[PDB]
Design a protein around this motif. Structure first.
Motif, PDB file in Angstrom:
ATOM      1  N   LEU A  89      14.087  38.837  25.179  1.00  0.00           N
ATOM      2  CA  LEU A  89      15.197  39.692  24.681  1.00  0.00           C
ATOM      3  C   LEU A  89      16.289  38.849  24.020  1.00  0.00           C
ATOM      4  O   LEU A  89      16.712  37.834  24.613  1.00  0.00           O
ATOM      5  N   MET A  90      16.728  39.291  22.837  1.00  0.00           N
ATOM      6  CA  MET A  90      17.905  38.755  22.109  1.00  0.00           C
ATOM      7  C   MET A  90      18.618  39.901  21.388  1.00  0.00           C
ATOM      8  O   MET A  90      17.969  40.613  20.587  1.00  0.00           O
ATOM      9  N   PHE A  91      19.912  40.062  21.658  1.00  0.00           N
ATOM     10  CA  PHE A  91      20.784  41.026  20.950  1.00  0.00           C
ATOM     11  C   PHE A  91      22.185  40.435  20.824  1.00  0.00           C
ATOM     12  O   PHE A  91      22.459  39.358  21.393  1.00  0.00           O
ATOM     13  N   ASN A  92      23.032  41.128  20.068  1.00  0.00           N
ATOM     14  CA  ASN A  92      24.410  40.691  19.734  1.00  0.00           C
ATOM     15  C   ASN A  92      25.242  40.679  21.022  1.00  0.00           C
ATOM     16  O   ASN A  92      25.558  41.760  21.542  1.00  0.00           O
ATOM     17  N   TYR A 110      24.720  39.033  15.936  1.00  0.00           N
ATOM     18  CA  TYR A 110      23.888  40.014  15.190  1.00  0.00           C
ATOM     19  C   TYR A 110      22.822  39.284  14.361  1.00  0.00           C
ATOM     20  O   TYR A 110      21.618  39.605  14.503  1.00  0.00           O
ATOM     21  N   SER A 111      23.248  38.342  13.511  1.00  0.00           N
ATOM     22  CA  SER A 111      22.360  37.583  12.592  1.00  0.00           C
ATOM     23  C   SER A 111      21.252  36.894  13.392  1.00  0.00           C
ATOM     24  O   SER A 111      20.084  37.048  13.021  1.00  0.00           O
ATOM     25  N   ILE A 112      21.619  36.156  14.443  1.00  0.00           N
ATOM     26  CA  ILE A 112      20.670  35.311  15.227  1.00  0.00           C
ATOM     27  C   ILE A 112      19.625  36.212  15.889  1.00  0.00           C
ATOM     28  O   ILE A 112      18.429  35.887  15.792  1.00  0.00           O
ATOM     29  N   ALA A 113      20.062  37.291  16.540  1.00  0.00           N
ATOM     30  CA  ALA A 113      19.182  38.242  17.259  1.00  0.00           C
ATOM     31  C   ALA A 113      18.223  38.895  16.256  1.00  0.00           C
ATOM     32  O   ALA A 113      17.009  38.934  16.527  1.00  0.00           O
ATOM     33  N   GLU A 114      18.749  39.355  15.119  1.00  0.00           N
ATOM     34  CA  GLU A 114      17.963  40.056  14.068  1.00  0.00           C
ATOM     35  C   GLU A 114      16.911  39.107  13.494  1.00  0.00           C
ATOM     36  O   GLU A 114      15.732  39.505  13.421  1.00  0.00           O
ATOM     37  N   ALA A 115      17.338  37.912  13.078  1.00  0.00           N
ATOM     38  CA  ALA A 115      16.460  36.851  12.535  1.00  0.00           C
ATOM     39  C   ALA A 115      15.353  36.548  13.549  1.00  0.00           C
ATOM     40  O   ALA A 115      14.179  36.514  13.148  1.00  0.00           O
ATOM     41  N   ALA A 116      15.724  36.355  14.816  1.00  0.00           N
ATOM     42  CA  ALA A 116      14.802  35.990  15.916  1.00  0.00           C
ATOM     43  C   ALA A 116      13.736  37.080  16.069  1.00  0.00           C
ATOM     44  O   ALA A 116      12.534  36.743  16.026  1.00  0.00           O
ATOM     45  N   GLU A 158       9.967  35.931  17.150  1.00  0.00           N
ATOM     46  CA  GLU A 158      10.309  34.854  18.124  1.00  0.00           C
ATOM     47  C   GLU A 158      10.685  35.465  19.480  1.00  0.00           C
ATOM     48  O   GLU A 158      10.426  34.810  20.508  1.00  0.00           O
ATOM     49  N   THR A 159      11.292  36.655  19.483  1.00  0.00           N
ATOM     50  CA  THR A 159      11.711  37.384  20.712  1.00  0.00           C
ATOM     51  C   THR A 159      11.004  38.746  20.750  1.00  0.00           C
ATOM     52  O   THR A 159      10.878  39.376  19.690  1.00  0.00           O
ATOM     53  N   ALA A 160      10.559  39.174  21.933  1.00  0.00           N
ATOM     54  CA  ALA A 160       9.740  40.393  22.137  1.00  0.00           C
ATOM     55  C   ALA A 160      10.590  41.650  21.941  1.00  0.00           C
ATOM     56  O   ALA A 160      10.014  42.698  21.613  1.00  0.00           O
ATOM     57  N   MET A 161      11.899  41.564  22.165  1.00  0.00           N
ATOM     58  CA  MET A 161      12.779  42.756  22.167  1.00  0.00           C
ATOM     59  C   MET A 161      14.137  42.419  21.567  1.00  0.00           C
ATOM     60  O   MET A 161      14.550  41.246  21.610  1.00  0.00           O
ATOM     61  N   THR A 162      14.800  43.450  21.055  1.00  0.00           N
ATOM     62  CA  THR A 162      16.219  43.405  20.657  1.00  0.00           C
ATOM     63  C   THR A 162      16.856  44.740  21.027  1.00  0.00           C
ATOM     64  O   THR A 162      16.128  45.663  21.454  1.00  0.00           O
ATOM     65  N   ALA A 221      19.260  49.019  11.495  1.00  0.00           N
ATOM     66  CA  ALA A 221      18.496  47.753  11.635  1.00  0.00           C
ATOM     67  C   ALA A 221      17.018  47.921  11.227  1.00  0.00           C
ATOM     68  O   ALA A 221      16.356  46.889  10.982  1.00  0.00           O
ATOM     69  N   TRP A 222      16.503  49.148  11.136  1.00  0.00           N
ATOM     70  CA  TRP A 222      15.043  49.389  10.979  1.00  0.00           C
ATOM     71  C   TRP A 222      14.537  48.875   9.625  1.00  0.00           C
ATOM     72  O   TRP A 222      13.394  48.381   9.580  1.00  0.00           O
TER      73      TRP A 222
END
Ligand SMILES: OC[C@H]1O[C@H](O[C@H]2[C@H](O)[C@@H](O)[C@@H](O[C@H]3[C@H](O)[C@@H](O)[C@@H](O[C@H]4[C@H](O)[C@@H](O)[C@@H](O)O[C@@H]4CO)O[C@@H]3CO)O[C@@H]2CO)[C@H](O)[C@@H](O)[C@@H]1O
Lengths: 506, 11, 7
Positions: free
Chosen positions: A145-148, A208-214, A219-223, A229-230
């Motif tokens: 998981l990665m989010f803002n 926001y940028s890092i989580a979205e890019a990831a 790289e990350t299973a969830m946000t 964002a879609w």
């Protein structure tokens, strides 16, 4: 603001190019050029201007519009009953302040769990599973998981799940003295967030940028993110699902529900053109389609088009999360709440403060009432054709303090004192009624001390310092002896003012 | 009352 | 007080 033109402000995460296409169609029919802009911090910049070059229309979630309406920045929108019936009456309720409609509702927004179906076929139903899932994914060089984590909008659903709230609803209104930021529910939620960071399951620096890019690079299973964002995920190679947010302590995550709303600037000379564009171009099937195509809006306020999009499972999940969440208050105090909780989450996340310290300050800051009164002050100075030989006076000048908005300043101001240089008779000039100004002649520049007293004697007077400017600093205007205008914008801030004083300020 | 922490802007 | 044509 320029006449015969529409300037629109919308946030950089929304479909501003799609909105521009609606502007081109409007230009085609009317000849009126629509300029769409997405300036940084537009929701902070808007009050500073609105204006000279402030926008005709401002877009934001409905939460900020109550503060704008209090300051008197918005025109009361006048949609006919036939038009109101075309939008969901829920959405109209979100854009109502003190009984009056102050914006057009565009779309209902809620955060959903977005997950990589290849990496994570069965998404987790609980927050409590994610540490285990992350350890399992870390072994395969991925994260769960990665989010803002910079914006409290994204962390609130977790904080609110076990009992966090902004303002207790009581006696038919939000009670701003009853804040729900440092109760056991809020502490449990933010503690779970802080523990994810302490255990290397997330990174306090993630924005926001890092989580979205990831997420979009797999790289990350969830946000955690909204409909807007879609589009960028579509452009990526990720097979994504939009689903219900994970439960915390067996209770649903409670995202703050946003109604994307369009307000008309009170200073706009193009209110009629704004009405025409919003009612008959944007809030139509074809108009919302152009915006939605660029960045999905969520559940649109226009019934006809909402029905056409309703079958999209991503929208169904958006409304599932919306239903478990809470409509954002639109009251002025919501600004103070958001800033307070942003501080609490970043400090707790960074480890500058404990959860208890961070939330105890936010509890205090979220409830702190700040009333802002924008002012202008300074002087105008006119050169005499020639020097008056009797006293060597060269200039006539007026020093002044005026409200930035067209209001009676004497409702909250008791008197304004202008202290002039000793060379003037009765150098302490006191003005008890408007206009708050002193006109004089002279030969010299000097500092005027301006002291503004309030009806509540316990409200600490404001002292301003103004260099009386007679001589032009611009060389061409110096050679030309052009009239000098040295005036400054400033804001008088009232913190937790007395009951008497709050009425006088509003 | 107090003036805003943000510097005054010339107009 | 600091008074001059330009200050
Ligand atoms: O503190 C420094 C930051 O200040 C600025 O952000 C502020 C805003 O001025 C406040 O209005 C508030 O923001 C809320 C916002 O009002 C609310 O609608 C919601 O925003 C969502 C939005 O609904 C959604 O459509 C999408 O755009 O995501 C937004 C969240 O990113 O939630 C906001 C709170 O997160 O409080 C913030 C402070 O957090 C300024 O914009 C920043 O650049 C600045 O760093």
């Amino acid at each position: 603001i320029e006449e015969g033109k529409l300037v629109i402000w919308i946030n950089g995460d929304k479909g501003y190019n799609g909105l521009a296409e609606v502007g081109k169609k409007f230009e085609k029919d009317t000849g009126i050029k629509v300029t769409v802009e997405h300036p940084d911090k537009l929701e902070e910049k808007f009050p500073q201007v609105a204006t000279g070059d402030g926008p005709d229309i401002i877009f934001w979630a409905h939460d900020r519009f109550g503060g704008y309406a209090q300051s008197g920045l918005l025109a009361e929108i006048t949609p006919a009953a036939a038009f109101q019936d075309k939008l969901y009456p829920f959405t109209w309720d979100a854009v109502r302040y003190n009984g009056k409609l102050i914006a057009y509702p565009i779309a209902v927004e809620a955060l959903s769990l977005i997950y990589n179906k290849d990496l994570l076929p069965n998404p987790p139903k609980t927050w409590e599973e994610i540490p285990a899932l992350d350890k399992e994914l870390k072994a395969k060089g991925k994260s769960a998981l990665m989010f803002n984590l910079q914006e409290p909008y994204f962390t609130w659903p977790l904080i609110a799940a076990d009992g966090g709230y902004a303002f207790k609803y009581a006696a038919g209104k939000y009670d701003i003295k009853d804040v729900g930021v440092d109760n056991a529910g809020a502490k449990a939620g933010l503690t779970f967030l802080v523990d994810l960071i302490k255990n290397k399951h997330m990174n306090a620096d993630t924005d926001y940028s890092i989580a979205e890019a990831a997420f979009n690079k797999g790289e990350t299973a969830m946000t955690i993110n909204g409909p807007w964002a879609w589009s960028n995920i579509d452009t990526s190679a990720v097979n994504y699902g939009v689903t219900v947010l994970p439960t915390f302590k067996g209770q649903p995550s409670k995202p703050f529900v946003g109604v994307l709303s369009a307000g008309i600037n009170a200073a706009s000379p193009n209110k009629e053109l704004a009405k025409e564009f919003l009612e008959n171009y944007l809030l139509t099937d074809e108009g919302l389609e152009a915006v939605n195509k660029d960045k999905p809006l969520g559940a649109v306020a226009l019934k006809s088009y909402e029905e056409e999009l309703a079958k999209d499972p991503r929208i169904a999940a958006t409304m599932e999360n919306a239903q478990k969440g809470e409509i954002m208050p639109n009251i002025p105090q919501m600004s103070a709440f958001w800033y307070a909780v942003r501080t609490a989450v970043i400090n707790a996340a960074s480890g500058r403060q404990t959860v208890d310290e961070a939330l105890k300050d936010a509890q205090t800051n979220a409830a702190a009432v700040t009333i802002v009164k924008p002012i202008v002050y300074g002087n105008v100075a006119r050169y005499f054709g020639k020097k008056r030989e009797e006293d060597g006076h060269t200039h006539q000048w007026t020093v002044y303090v005026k409200p930035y908005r067209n209001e009676d300043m004497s409702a909250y101001v008791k008197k304004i004192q202008f202290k002039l240089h000793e060379s003037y008779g009765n150098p302490l000039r006191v003005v008890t009624k408007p206009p708050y100004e002193i006109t004089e002649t002279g030969w010299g520049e000097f500092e005027i001390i301006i002291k503004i007293f309030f009806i509540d004697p316990n409200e600490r007077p404001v002292t301003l310092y103004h260099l009386l400017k007679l001589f032009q600093s611009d060389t061409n205007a110096m050679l030309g002896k052009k009239t000098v205008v040295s005036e400054f914008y400033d804001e008088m801030i009232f913190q937790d003012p007395t009951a008497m004083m709050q009425q006088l300020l509003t | 009352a107090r003036t805003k922490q943000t510097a005054r802007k010339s107009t």
